[PDB]
């Protein structure tokens, strides 16, 4: 049978974009977003520096603060704190999420 | 009856008519019982002579 099974799979990066599509944003925010989550590993932290990503935009208007925003918006997606850019803060993000009630 | 209801009155009337007819039929077919049994059917006595 020609295609046998050929079940196309999830792939993480593929998973990241499916929520990119239903997040609401502008074309510039959706452009940077594709850039950001383009550059992300199987482990999940990002490969390139954030100032590098600014060089990938090639736009005078684009700024680090703007990138800080789109990034952090998609920084708590699925699963938790992914697109880390050097763990320390990844841990800090997962801490971030759960309740004050837990001691220590 | 349903054909004449459709022709004369319209679509909605014959539809609601068919619905009420079905409801009344479901009610009366269970209120009547309509049983079956061995002695229900009768074999003619003349059969033994015709054979």
């Amino acid at each position: 049978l020609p295609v046998y099974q050929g079940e196309t799979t999830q792939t993480l990066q593929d998973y990241l974009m499916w929520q990119v599509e239903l997040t609401p944003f502008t074309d510039t925010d959706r452009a940077i977003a594709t850039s950001i989550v383009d550059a992300v590993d199987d482990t999940g932290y990002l490969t390139i520096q954030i100032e590098d990503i600014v060089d990938s935009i090639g736009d005078d208007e684009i700024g680090l603060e703007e990138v800080e925003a789109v990034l952090k918006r998609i920084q708590r997606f699925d699963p938790v704190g992914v697109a880390a850019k050097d763990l320390r803060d990844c841990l800090l993000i997962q801490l971030s999420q759960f309740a004050k009630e837990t001691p220590w | 009856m349903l054909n004449t209801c459709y022709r004369i009155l319209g679509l909605k009337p014959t539809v609601i008519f068919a619905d009420q007819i079905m409801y009344t039929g479901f009610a009366y077919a269970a209120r009547s019982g309509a049983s079956v049994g061995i002695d229900d059917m009768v074999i003619p006595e003349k059969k033994h002579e015709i054979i």
Partner: protein, 148 residues
């Protein structure tokens, strides 16, 4: 003999018996014949027949979903079915069955986005199976292309 056997256990030889209604408490006319039948359950149960799907994994060739419940598959549309659809004159429903619920890759995500956002708008584009057919025809010594 069956009728004679009904007399030893104090039962009517005719086999009929009166029954009451469990909801109105009224006696039924035309007495119903009751009995004891040997019933057997079949393997065709409803617990395995039912199968639903909204969105799952598709195939790499012709980009069609899996199918008959194989890893969360979906049902198949038929030729008699599109004939019946054309009998109703449902062109938009047909186009939806051809692009939305089909191998159209650039349309599924857009339709999902429009449904989540509440837009209810369709963008047909072009199915991937037609492109696969074009490539498979071009694999031989026969040129084929679409004009403007």
């Amino acid at each position: 003999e069956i009728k004679e056997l009904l007399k030893l256990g104090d039962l009517p030889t005719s086999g009929q018996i009166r029954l009451y209604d469990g909801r109105t408490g009224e006696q039924f006319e035309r007495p119903v014949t009751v009995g004891y039948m040997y019933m057997l359950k079949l393997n065709h149960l409803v617990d395995d027949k039912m199968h639903a799907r909204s969105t799952g994994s598709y195939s790499l060739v012709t980009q069609q979903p899996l199918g008959g419940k194989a890893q969360f598959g979906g049902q198949r549309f038929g030729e008699m079915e599109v004939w019946a659809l054309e009998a109703y004159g449902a062109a938009y429903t047909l186009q939806e069955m051809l692009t939305v619920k089909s191998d159209d890759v650039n349309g599924r995500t857009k339709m999902y986005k429009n449904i989540v956002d509440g837009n209810h708008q369709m963008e047909p584009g072009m199915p991937e199976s037609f492109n696969v057919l074009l490539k498979e025809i071009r694999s031989l010594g026969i040129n084929i292309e679409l004009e403007d």
